[PDB]
Design an enzyme around this catalytic site. Structure first.
Site, PDB file in Angstrom:
ATOM      1  N   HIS A  62      48.998  44.232  44.138  1.00  0.00           N
ATOM      2  CA  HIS A  62      47.641  43.968  44.727  1.00  0.00           C
ATOM      3  C   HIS A  62      47.554  42.508  45.063  1.00  0.00           C
ATOM      4  O   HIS A  62      47.062  42.186  46.206  1.00  0.00           O
ATOM      5  CB  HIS A  62      46.504  44.391  43.783  1.00  0.00           C
ATOM      6  CG  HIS A  62      46.627  45.803  43.258  1.00  0.00           C
ATOM      7  ND1 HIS A  62      46.526  46.899  44.098  1.00  0.00           N
ATOM      8  CD2 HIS A  62      46.857  46.281  42.012  1.00  0.00           C
ATOM      9  CE1 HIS A  62      46.621  48.005  43.346  1.00  0.00           C
ATOM     10  NE2 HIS A  62      46.889  47.668  42.112  1.00  0.00           N
ATOM     11  N   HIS A  92      44.420  34.342  40.184  1.00  0.00           N
ATOM     12  CA  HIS A  92      45.009  35.025  41.301  1.00  0.00           C
ATOM     13  C   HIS A  92      44.162  34.684  42.549  1.00  0.00           C
ATOM     14  O   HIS A  92      43.123  34.049  42.438  1.00  0.00           O
ATOM     15  CB  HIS A  92      45.037  36.548  41.117  1.00  0.00           C
ATOM     16  CG  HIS A  92      43.639  37.100  40.937  1.00  0.00           C
ATOM     17  ND1 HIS A  92      43.023  37.166  39.712  1.00  0.00           N
ATOM     18  CD2 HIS A  92      42.760  37.576  41.838  1.00  0.00           C
ATOM     19  CE1 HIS A  92      41.777  37.598  39.904  1.00  0.00           C
ATOM     20  NE2 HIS A  92      41.585  37.829  41.195  1.00  0.00           N
ATOM     21  N   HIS A  94      42.757  36.219  46.647  1.00  0.00           N
ATOM     22  CA  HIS A  94      42.535  37.204  47.659  1.00  0.00           C
ATOM     23  C   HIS A  94      42.649  36.478  49.006  1.00  0.00           C
ATOM     24  O   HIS A  94      42.173  35.348  49.118  1.00  0.00           O
ATOM     25  CB  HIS A  94      41.126  37.900  47.546  1.00  0.00           C
ATOM     26  CG  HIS A  94      40.865  38.421  46.186  1.00  0.00           C
ATOM     27  ND1 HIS A  94      40.980  39.765  45.897  1.00  0.00           N
ATOM     28  CD2 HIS A  94      40.551  37.825  45.009  1.00  0.00           C
ATOM     29  CE1 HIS A  94      40.712  39.946  44.600  1.00  0.00           C
ATOM     30  NE2 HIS A  94      40.437  38.791  44.047  1.00  0.00           N
ATOM     31  N   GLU A 104      36.343  36.978  49.316  1.00  0.00           N
ATOM     32  CA  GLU A 104      35.516  38.130  48.810  1.00  0.00           C
ATOM     33  C   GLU A 104      34.044  37.739  48.887  1.00  0.00           C
ATOM     34  O   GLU A 104      33.261  38.366  49.599  1.00  0.00           O
ATOM     35  CB  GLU A 104      35.977  38.452  47.374  1.00  0.00           C
ATOM     36  CG  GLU A 104      37.365  39.017  47.398  1.00  0.00           C
ATOM     37  CD  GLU A 104      37.669  39.872  46.266  1.00  0.00           C
ATOM     38  OE1 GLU A 104      37.459  39.512  45.107  1.00  0.00           O
ATOM     39  OE2 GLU A 104      38.156  41.043  46.521  1.00  0.00           O
ATOM     40  N   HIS A 117      40.507  33.047  42.117  1.00  0.00           N
ATOM     41  CA  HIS A 117      39.708  33.501  40.927  1.00  0.00           C
ATOM     42  C   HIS A 117      40.430  33.069  39.664  1.00  0.00           C
ATOM     43  O   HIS A 117      41.576  33.547  39.397  1.00  0.00           O
ATOM     44  CB  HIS A 117      39.599  35.022  40.966  1.00  0.00           C
ATOM     45  CG  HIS A 117      38.706  35.502  42.047  1.00  0.00           C
ATOM     46  ND1 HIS A 117      38.692  36.779  42.538  1.00  0.00           N
ATOM     47  CD2 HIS A 117      37.750  34.791  42.718  1.00  0.00           C
ATOM     48  CE1 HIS A 117      37.762  36.846  43.471  1.00  0.00           C
ATOM     49  NE2 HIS A 117      37.149  35.659  43.598  1.00  0.00           N
ATOM     50  N   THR A 196      36.081  42.637  40.992  1.00  0.00           N
ATOM     51  CA  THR A 196      36.136  43.025  42.390  1.00  0.00           C
ATOM     52  C   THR A 196      37.250  44.035  42.704  1.00  0.00           C
ATOM     53  O   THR A 196      37.393  44.411  43.866  1.00  0.00           O
ATOM     54  CB  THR A 196      36.237  41.816  43.307  1.00  0.00           C
ATOM     55  OG1 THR A 196      37.535  41.280  43.158  1.00  0.00           O
ATOM     56  CG2 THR A 196      35.137  40.820  43.071  1.00  0.00           C
ATOM     57  N   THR A 197      38.022  44.409  41.709  1.00  0.00           N
ATOM     58  CA  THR A 197      39.010  45.474  41.830  1.00  0.00           C
ATOM     59  C   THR A 197      38.674  46.508  40.805  1.00  0.00           C
ATOM     60  O   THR A 197      38.053  46.271  39.786  1.00  0.00           O
ATOM     61  CB  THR A 197      40.447  44.966  41.547  1.00  0.00           C
ATOM     62  OG1 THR A 197      40.643  44.706  40.157  1.00  0.00           O
ATOM     63  CG2 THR A 197      40.830  43.823  42.384  1.00  0.00           C
TER      64      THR A 197
HETATM   65  C1  LIG Z   1      40.193  46.969  32.336  1.00  0.00           C
HETATM   66  O1  LIG Z   1      40.029  45.702  32.913  1.00  0.00           O
HETATM   67  C2  LIG Z   1      40.712  45.288  34.029  1.00  0.00           C
HETATM   68  O2  LIG Z   1      41.669  45.968  34.419  1.00  0.00           O
HETATM   69  C3  LIG Z   1      40.413  43.916  34.680  1.00  0.00           C
HETATM   70  C4  LIG Z   1      41.696  43.651  35.399  1.00  0.00           C
HETATM   71  N1  LIG Z   1      41.986  42.215  35.692  1.00  0.00           N
HETATM   72  C5  LIG Z   1      41.190  41.533  36.717  1.00  0.00           C
HETATM   73  C6  LIG Z   1      41.080  42.069  38.012  1.00  0.00           C
HETATM   74  C7  LIG Z   1      40.202  41.444  38.912  1.00  0.00           C
HETATM   75  C8  LIG Z   1      39.468  40.343  38.594  1.00  0.00           C
HETATM   76  S1  LIG Z   1      38.429  39.617  39.766  1.00  0.00           S
HETATM   77  N2  LIG Z   1      39.023  39.869  41.218  1.00  0.00           N
HETATM   78  O3  LIG Z   1      37.160  40.274  39.619  1.00  0.00           O
HETATM   79  O4  LIG Z   1      38.487  38.204  39.415  1.00  0.00           O
HETATM   80  C9  LIG Z   1      39.497  39.972  37.271  1.00  0.00           C
HETATM   81  C10 LIG Z   1      40.289  40.624  36.325  1.00  0.00           C
HETATM   82  C11 LIG Z   1      42.652  41.366  34.794  1.00  0.00           C
HETATM   83  N3  LIG Z   1      43.363  41.929  33.815  1.00  0.00           N
HETATM   84  C12 LIG Z   1      43.880  40.970  33.003  1.00  0.00           C
HETATM   85  C13 LIG Z   1      44.617  41.406  31.765  1.00  0.00           C
HETATM   86  C14 LIG Z   1      43.539  39.701  33.361  1.00  0.00           C
HETATM   87  S2  LIG Z   1      42.612  39.708  34.721  1.00  0.00           S
HETATM   88 ZN   LIG Z   2      39.871  38.381  42.132  1.00  0.00          ZN
END
Ligand SMILES: COC(=O)CCN(c1ccc(S(N)(=O)=O)cc1)c1nc(C)cs1
Ligand SMILES: [Zn+2]
EC number: 4.2.1.1
Length: 257
Positions: A62, A92, A94, A104, A117, A196-197
């Site tokens: 992703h 990470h 986008h 986003e 982010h 956001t995912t």
């Molecule tokens: C069950 O929770 C998730 O899968 C969140 C997934 N994810 C994640 C995905 C998106 C975003 S965003 N795009 O909202 O910043 C933040 C966290 C992350 N998982 C880890 C272990 C660190 S960051």
């Molecule tokens: Zn993000």
């Protein structure tokens, strides 16, 4: 048939596997700067990244994630709109297929080329997986990217990308200092939202900096050489991995300035 960004599995389909996609505090949103209320009770944001320990960089199919040591009190975010202490776990981005899209959040409907982010979890909940189950579990620091002058602090990330082209690939990535990714000013907007995912959990205090950072065309072009597919699969460029703006509903965006 997993979620993604494509025509058959992208944001308009997520609600079938993740009902909360149509929830009351989804992200991202458009930031209407004229309606955002200045809140003099908001504190300066405290970003204390002096002891941050990056460990590895991962293509998760992703985006790419730069992961940190979050087993001690290092790399924290506090102040701002936050109560207590949030620990950096990873960052990470986008980004778009073209310079005209990729962020986003939007600002008065303006799309930036990309959005960084920096993800942090509330230490009150002991680790990330418990934090994401709570309304105040995470704080995500969002920073816009515009194309212009290179960001020298980004180049270490750019240069490692060729080693993680494809989904599932990871590379050692130690000693990366995320302070080099920050703009000069910490003025921000803030509101309550979501991941956001998928799984789209409603656990995030969003803190979006007003000032974008500059990256070069060549730096973003290298993001767009990544692949969403795994090795030995047909090539699908990692581009347009952004969810568009969602309804604000019963929320207020507050400005620190
Ligand atoms: C069950 O929770 C998730 O899968 C969140 C997934 N994810 C994640 C995905 C998106 C975003 S965003 N795009 O909202 O910043 C933040 C966290 C992350 N998982 C880890 C272990 C660190 S960051
Ligand atoms: Zn993000």
């Amino acid at each position: 048939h997993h979620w993604g960004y494509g025509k058959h599995n992208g944001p308009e389909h997520w609600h079938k596997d993740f009902p909360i996609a149509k929830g009351e505090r989804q992200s991202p949103v458009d930031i209407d700067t004229h309606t955002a209320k200045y809140d003099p009770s908001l504190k300066p944001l405290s970003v204390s990244y002096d002891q941050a320990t990056s460990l590895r960089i991962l293509n998760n199919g992703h985006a790419f994630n730069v992961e940190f040591d979050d087993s001690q009190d290092k790399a924290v975010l506090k102040g701002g709109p936050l109560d207590g202490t949030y620990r950096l776990i990873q960052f990470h981005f986008h980004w778009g297929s073209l310079d005209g899209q990729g962020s986003e959040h939007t600002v008065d409907k303006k799309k930036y080329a990309a959005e960084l982010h920096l993800v942090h979890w509330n230490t009150k909940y002991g680790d990330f997986g418990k934090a994401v189950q709570q309304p105040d579990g995470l704080a995500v620091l969002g920073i816009f990217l515009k194309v212009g002058s290179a960001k020298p602090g980004l180049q270490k990330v750019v240069d490692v990308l060729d080693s993680i082209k494809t989904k599932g690939k990871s590379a050692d990535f130690t000693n990366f200092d995320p302070r080099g990714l920050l703009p000069e000013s910490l003025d921000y907007w803030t509101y309550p939202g979501s991941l956001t995912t998928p799984p789209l959990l409603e656990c995030v205090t969003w803190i979006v900096l007003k000032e974008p950072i500059s990256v070069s065309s060549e730096q973003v072009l290298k993001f767009r050489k990544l692949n969403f597919n795994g090795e030995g699969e047909p090539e699908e460029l990692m581009v347009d991995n952004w969810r568009p703006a969602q309804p604000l509903k019963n929320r207020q965006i507050k400005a620190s300035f």
